[PDB]
């Protein structure tokens, strides 16, 4: 029994001065998070520290407002939707130049898909239904005039960067796309600044001595160690030269060896995350392309099975997820996986299906219905995530007894950038979920989107999706959405399986560090870090 709560683990008051290494996995190449070539977690992770946020996701996955930066942000009117926010006279970038809807104008004028079209952006979230954003004489209080109704608006304006300075260097896209992208920044609006970086190896942060926050700094240094072998993680740790790794393949041998350093001050702590694992079918092209195969292998796929070898050996009562937009613990989840059939390890039944749409077996191989072998099946998945590669060579095993073989794929090609309608038939990966499963299932699902890689194309899912989007409440969006969630399971192109661990294993010297488990990370609160006075 623990007085922790989800976001309150690890809480105390650090002394002042020191230093924090926290290692990340990726070099870094593009310092904007916003961009499609920054967009993942250790650049989010690291930029976190300098990048002012109207919103933040907590551990809980709730949105908590920025209080150091925002006085107030309020939805005034919805004839028509109107946001208004108010920035502290306090908020000010590291050259002391104040915060301003100037910073807002110009994140917005990013994102909006309008002003700058040639904005490299990763995705607009939504910013694209603002259609006027306006600022007082002051420049501290945003209004916000949306052309149409839209649920996320707590989600924007989550990465602010300087207009004054982007002004600077170039026109909007220019300054986007060159200096907020490729330069070192050495600007801040957070509770630290970037002092050096070193390619390939080390980024150094130091107090921004013009933090306007109610809490910290508390160190001399934040540094962040760049370790591209996720696999020596731990052993950097170990040997010191770490003090906080945030692994993203959690094993059981991971958690067995963090376990025998607590004679080193090491602690860990694991939570489902937002990342959860699928197995998506190619119903664009080759086998797949025949709903009555893809049904029959999601009902000869034995969940239980997949979760009893590869989580709940180290894992206690870790849920399935049978829904593909929703989480267990989100409004709207419920196991439309298992109501179909999927995931029941049901062999017989799988056969049936196969038989009733005219597949026959001859020798131990299936023939397709005009009397063609099916081909070996391609099962690609990325590497990094041993239960990925564990789960592949499960699924083989269920399906070989409907006559179907399996080539498995991996390696740096296998991943879901790569894909193709005309190389995978079968991809293991994850998919991160968002606050808002609404604005998640709009990039997707809908037809004519990146990552619709398994080939939803129903024009009703979409207006779903849309009339979820312009909900009033996240239960009243999650009400809509469950319907597109029923309709995405019947299609049978994508089969959730489980969240994945999340692995924060660190000295636990350290203060107010704790897992966000969710796509914004333990870098979520660096104000806060510190070391315990001895």
Not at 64 to 80: G, I, Q, R, V, Y
Not at 260 to 283: E, K, R, T, V
Not at 394 to 420: E, H, M
Request: charged letters at 20%.
């Amino acid at each position: 029994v623990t007085g922790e709560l989800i976001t309150t683990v690890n809480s105390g008051t650090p002394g002042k001065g020191g230093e924090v290494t926290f290692a990340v996995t990726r070099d870094i190449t593009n310092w904007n998070v916003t961009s499609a070539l920054g967009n993942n977690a250790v650049v989010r992770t690291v930029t976190l520290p300098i990048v002012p946020s109207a919103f933040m996701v907590q551990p809980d996955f709730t949105l908590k407002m920025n209080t150091d930066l925002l006085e107030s942000a309020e939805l005034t009117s919805t004839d028509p939707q109107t946001v208004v926010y108010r920035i502290r006279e306090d908020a000010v970038w590291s050259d002391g130049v104040p915060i301003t809807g100037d910073d807002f104008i110009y994140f917005w004028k990013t994102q909006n898909r309008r002003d700058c079209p040639e904005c490299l952006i990763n995705a607009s979230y939504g910013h694209d239904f603002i259609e006027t954003l306006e600022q007082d004489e002051t420049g501290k209080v945003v209004t916000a005039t949306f052309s149409e109704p839209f649920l996320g608006w707590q989600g924007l304006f989550m990465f602010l960067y300087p207009a004054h300075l982007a002004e600077k260097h170039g026109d909007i896209a220019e300054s986007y796309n060159n200096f907020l992208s490729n330069e070192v920044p050495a600007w801040s609006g957070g509770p630290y600044m970037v002092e050096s970086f070193d390619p390939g190896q080390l980024v150094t942060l130091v107090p921004n001595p013009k933090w306007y926050g109610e809490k910290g700094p508390y160190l001399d240094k934040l540094k962040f160690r760049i370790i591209t072998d996720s696999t020596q993680q731990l052993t950097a740790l170990e040997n010191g030269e770490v003090d906080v790794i945030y692994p993203q393949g959690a094993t059981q041998d991971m958690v067995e060896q963090a376990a025998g350093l607590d004679y080193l001050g090491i602690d860990f702590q694991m939570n489902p995350s937002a990342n959860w694992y699928f197995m998506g079918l190619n119903s664009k092209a080759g086998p797949m392309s025949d709903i009555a195969l893809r049904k029959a292998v999601l009902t000869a796929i034995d969940a239980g099975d997949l979760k009893a070898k590869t989580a709940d050996p180290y894992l206690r009562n870790w849920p399935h997820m049978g829904s593909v937009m929703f989480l267990p613990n989100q409004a709207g989840y419920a196991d439309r996986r298992g109501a179909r059939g999927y995931g029941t390890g049901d062999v017989e039944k799988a056969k049936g299906i196969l038989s009733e749409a005219g597949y026959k077996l001859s020798g131990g191989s299936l023939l397709d219905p005009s009397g063609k072998p099916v081909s070996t099946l391609r099962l690609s998945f990325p590497p990094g995530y041993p239960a990925a590669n564990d789960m592949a060579r499960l699924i083989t095993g269920y399906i070989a007894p409907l006559g179907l073989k399996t080539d498995l794929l991996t390696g740096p090609n296998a991943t879901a950038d790569y894909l193709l309608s005309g190389n995978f038939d079968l991809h293991l990966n994850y998919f991160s979920q968002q606050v808002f499963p609404a604005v998640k299932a709009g990039q997707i699902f809908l037809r004519d989107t990146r990552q619709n890689y398994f080939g939803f194309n129903d024009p009703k899912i979409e207006e779903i999706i849309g009339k979820a989007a312009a909900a009033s409440s996240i239960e009243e969006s999650a009400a809509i959405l469950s319907e597109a969630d029923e309709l995405a399971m019947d299609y049978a192109a994508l089969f959730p399986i489980y969240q994945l661990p999340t692995a924060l294993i660190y000295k636990e010297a350290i203060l107010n560090l704790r897992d966000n488990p969710n796509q914004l990370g333990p870098a979520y609160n660096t104000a806060e870090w510190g070391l315990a006075e001895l």
